[PDB]
Amino acid sequence: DFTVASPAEFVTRFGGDRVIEKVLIANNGIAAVKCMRSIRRWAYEMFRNERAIRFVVMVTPEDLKANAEYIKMADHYVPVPGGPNNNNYANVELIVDIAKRIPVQAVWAGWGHASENPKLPELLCKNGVAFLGPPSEAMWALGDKIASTVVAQTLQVPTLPWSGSGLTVEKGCVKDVDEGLEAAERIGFPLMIKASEGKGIRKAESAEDFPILFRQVQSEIPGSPIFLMKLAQHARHLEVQILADQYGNAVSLFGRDCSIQHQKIVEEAPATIAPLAIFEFMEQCAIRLAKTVGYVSAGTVEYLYSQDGSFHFLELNPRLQVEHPCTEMIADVNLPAAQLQIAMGVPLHRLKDIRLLYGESPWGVTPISFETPSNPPLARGHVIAARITSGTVQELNFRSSKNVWGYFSVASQFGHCFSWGENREEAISNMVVALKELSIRTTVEYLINLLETESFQNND
Ligand SMILES: CO[C@H]1CCCC[C@@H](c2ccccc2)OC(=O)[C@@H](C)[C@@]2(O)O[C@H]([C@@H](C)[C@H](O)[C@H]2OC)[C@@H](C)/C=C/[C@H]1OC
């Protein structure tokens, strides 16, 4: 029951270095609502004051007119220009201006908008405002495929066969249609042709298509180095959730599997499809990759997992994702709260949810071995999340299942349902009961059919 009186006192007593008590959310809809609800629950527990951390939000004319819920939920709101998001939520310069003027001490971008633009943390730090996300230098490194892949390889993180295979740090590009055909022959089709300076990209399904498509890329961005990368045929997408503080520690929070797809239609946590011993290496690979780029906050290492059992690095998504509650549930970690705490300079082993996940005492101050732990924490139960289809937010409470929750939002409606159970089967079964309630209809019939097939219930 450790509580304190103010954020100022929390920072001091938990080993941090920066007081954050007002945050600007550069987002709307479910992102804005989730951020505030997670952090206020944390402020309540820590400060006995749910409003100890104050929130300012950006609002477009379209969101105002709709009376989007997150407007009144916020402590203050700022009207911003309408139209495409480069005029509002993805406008780095606008975001920094507002942040600086209020002032707030931190920005949260969530997912979408400028959440992957390195220029955001860059310009914020330059103006003394914190970011609940990675620093620009980390984002720049993971930002482009080639450097990202070469970083992974050198760290022993397996990468897909590509023209730069073998390269290492302490000519992965082709020049001609003829050099390209040679490299393509070693790599195999289907494959990606990408000019490293672009788009400027083409999928070559065979070697007969290679010349035209390669030449197209050369025409599109003349002079740019071209690289070739294998496309995984019918691989699973697996994600490792990592959390990294400002002191060089990163911890994994198991991972998620995309067991149905071009949108992620169904996602699960944990990812049970892979043997635990290899997923554990996938986790350790993500930690090391995060550490060497200087990653801070929440991020996802995305992997391709094939049926034969091979996995390959795909990318580091430098932001929290909308499906993060799957992970939050099986790990019992409040992720937005963790980001806020980390942006205040609290180290991972002083995060109370991290200590509890690791069988330590909640307020202990002892360090924890995160990279290859001896007895790794166990995921708590299992979560299924399903995307439902066709900044205003409507929550779904199900009288049929106390362990299912979801929402749908208008920019036709997209949204997600989340189902927990004590195991994978209980989780799938709770989801089916709720979707059937939901049909008080076309996408649920679609999802119910899918969840009821032998193939899915046996996961392969
Ligand atoms: C927009 O607010 C919604 C978001 C619900 C997301 C789905 C749900 C869930 C996940 C899997 C299966 C079933 C349900 O996640 C949860 O309840 C859990 C994991 C979690 O997000 O709860 C929030 C925090 C304590 C923290 O972030 C995390 O706890 C560690 C609280 C503030 C609940 C808020 C909700 O509003 C009432």
Swiss-Prot record:
Binding site for Mn(2+) 1: 302, 315
Residues given in the record as Mg(2+) 2 binding sites: 315, 317
Span within the parent record: 241 to 750 of 2458
UniProt biotechnology annotation: Inhibition of ACACB may prevent lipid-induced insulin resistance and type 2 diabetes, making the enzyme a potential pharmaceutical target for treatment of obesity and type 2 diabetes.
Every Biotin carboxylation domain range: 19-460
Protein name as annotated: Acetyl-CoA carboxylase 2
Location of Phosphoserine modifications: 206
Subunit-structure text: Monomer, homodimer, and homotetramer. Forms filamentous polymers. Interacts with MID1IP1; interaction with MID1IP1 promotes oligomerization and increases its activity in a citrate-dependent manner.
Cellular location(s): Mitochondrion
Chain ranges of the ATP-grasp domain: 171-344
